[model samples]
Target: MSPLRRVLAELNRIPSSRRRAARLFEWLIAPMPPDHFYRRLWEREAVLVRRQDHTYYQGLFSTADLDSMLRNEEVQFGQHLDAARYINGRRETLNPPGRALPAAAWSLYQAGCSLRLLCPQAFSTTVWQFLAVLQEQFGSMAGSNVYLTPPNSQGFAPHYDDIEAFVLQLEGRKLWRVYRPRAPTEELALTSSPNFSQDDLGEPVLQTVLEPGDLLYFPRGFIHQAECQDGVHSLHLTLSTYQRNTWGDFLEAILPLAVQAAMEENVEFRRGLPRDFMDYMGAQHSDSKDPRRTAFMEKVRVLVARLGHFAPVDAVADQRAKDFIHDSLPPVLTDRERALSVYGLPIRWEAGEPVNVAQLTTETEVHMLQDGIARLVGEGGHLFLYYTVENSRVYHLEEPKCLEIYPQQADAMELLLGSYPEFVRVGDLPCDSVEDQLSLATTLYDKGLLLTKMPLA
Candidate 1:
């Protein structure tokens, strides 16, 4: 089984809770220090901060990538081949403690949302792509930028990130003094630039030294420090593991718990409500007739039906056909279809028939059978092989297929049949197939999904 496959299986066996989700990450995925991919990221025209903030050239690398980098001065002390830009305007001049600074070879700069937006054209690589899949499964996350300098004595004093971070050691070696946080969710302020303050809000924490090949995950709001006190410069990959609360309303803390309880309990079971069930088997519930009972049942109904329904973040505004590409096409299977073995264990595809696909989950694909039966396929390891019918673009169909669904992304088309009202704009999705690509306009016009707009005038 693949690493993620085992992880998913393990997580599935556990009870569904946010805490369990956190445990899955810490146990299965997060602990593996991103050895899959890590590159040397050096920057130019840079700045560094400490108790007395100063700007000097420095190197970056996780412990794993730190080899050979510390040995060769050319690689360690290489000139800034790329110009770097800071988030906001906070510039300062400094006379380095005796290290050469070279002119920038190339530079990338952007203002406004151009710098903040996640561009597939730029980050189509492995790490970011993996994170994209995470977004599809979980929710939105904050992407981090890598900043580096080579062969310079740039020191970073005690510090903490705005969010939780995982650092994968790359090239070179630097002394890191990491400390624990005072609280779980601590916050602090800097008296000087680079931030003189470290988070001591949560409980008292401990520290560990990270050498080459050493990967460490630093919880958000922890105090830490790094300095090239004794090594050639350094390089590393920092991954920020931060998530937003897309599952809650502003002041409704208990709503989720209540909803979950209702999902496991009867939709209406109070004051001998079960005795009344026989009389109202198929009778439509009337909220006006019984306000309190109707409200209770409504909560149960919504909880049961909409538990898995979620909203997507970061919509694409690009053409559907322009960016989609097909990678590999794997045939959909069924429990009766066939079984595959990884480590001498049987993995089956429990599915019914081929139908229109709507939304894909971490382990299942929902399809609508021709006879109006919605079938779910416990997706095998074939998820990685499924071709992106229209890349990663998001296009709305003029006519939608499933009345209960509003297709946002092309993948949603298989489930929600719809035709495009016009050549509507769509956000870019990963393109993986050309032959399977279908125009939203044509689909909606054909009544595959519900069409709210007409394709042509």
Candidate 2:
């Protein structure tokens, strides 16, 4: 089977609850295929999926759950400045020393300000898994931000985001008006007060009331405004998709490879532009006739022609993976989580233990503990990996960390790690020095890249 067909077939095997993509659309909103929705609405207009019953979204989130999360001291909150100011009294009330203030939720409700829980995934496992799968399909950075608005309140005026958004209503009803863009080509996010006039938005292209289980998709720059009706509380989850791989991004990956190819094949590409080229162009009204313009255009034509000779299509495909890994949000590894993960294994700080090490495995698959972008770098006769997580500085894994090996032992490590999922004896490594292999494993464990399985008897 083709790679894409195989991937889709694999997705079909996964249960609907865990999967979110073309198949999720098929199972949830079937009869009407997701491809049809994609062609008709996605990136072109706004679309809504309405449901009569709340059962579809029952477990996603609720008012009580939001209150509980707010009551948790670890959870962080933000107020929408456009709707209302930050209430100092409410802040002090809920955030009293050493106690979680549930009343803080009420104070914000009374203040008529919309509250936001940034990175809800940190506190909710459901949201975390959903966004993780969503990011896999989107091949971009996916984030979840929850908004809670009191009755008769609007968080922000009519505005549009640079990124595409999927709004899922989990509690209460929200009225949304999605209109055609005032600045149709403006691809960037507009701040509060886009100054949208009536003429600019004569009529909303799509207006609807969303209740539990309902979903709305707004493509990038689809001017929209949302409000909660009086006598109703509203809570919605906005799954934002950011950092779409554009054609410009593709060119960026190809340019370096193209330049390197030209260096070896074509000498003219190395030459500089004409000395008086800028002076001639500054005079203005210099049409195709100007010698400087002609020279510049000829060089451009030659370069464009040379581009056809250089093809790094593999790099083009790999670039998206690189960008996705770099921009994606990783889970915060709390101390409790780390301790529980290594509970069954003989984890020690010293390198002398005879413990088996393997990649950490989730319920789904085995994976490296390193959660961020990993880039392969070559230095001298060895290969290295530059791994980086969010906020932390880059870590360069040189010779030992890179897992480089001599010709004889090169495939030994690969076979043990990749082919043999079972724990292997570290002393049995085919390397010339078993001590070096054990030391490398120790370093990997220290760096959180390797996980302990069990001590060998």
Name the candidate that leads on lDDT.
Answer: 2
Provide the lDDT at 206 for model 1: 39
TM-score of 2: 0.67
Q: Distance (Å) between predicted and true CA of 193, model 1?
A: 11
Model 1 Cα shift for residue 237 (angstroms): 1.2
Error of 1 at 281 (Å): 51
Candidate 1 per-residue lDDT, tens place, 5-80, comes to 4544454444322333354344323433222312221110111112111111112222222222223222212221
Can you write out model 2's per-residue Cα lDDT over 1-457, one digit (the tens) per residue? 4322344345435433123344544533433577787678667777788766565655566677767776754543332111232232122223224323456556756778676666666667656645655554565777777878888777555657767788888888989998766564564443333534335565788898899877888877777877888799888889887544566667777888887887777777778767777766655746546676777777788787778578576655645554455555443333322442332344444578645543422212222332332444344556444333332211111122234444544444454444333444555555667555565555445454443443221
What residue runs in model 1 are displaced by over 4 Å at the alpha carbon? 1-102, 105-124, 149-152, 155-157, 183-194, 197-204, 246-457
**Best candidate (score: TM-score):** 2
lDDT of 1: 0.32
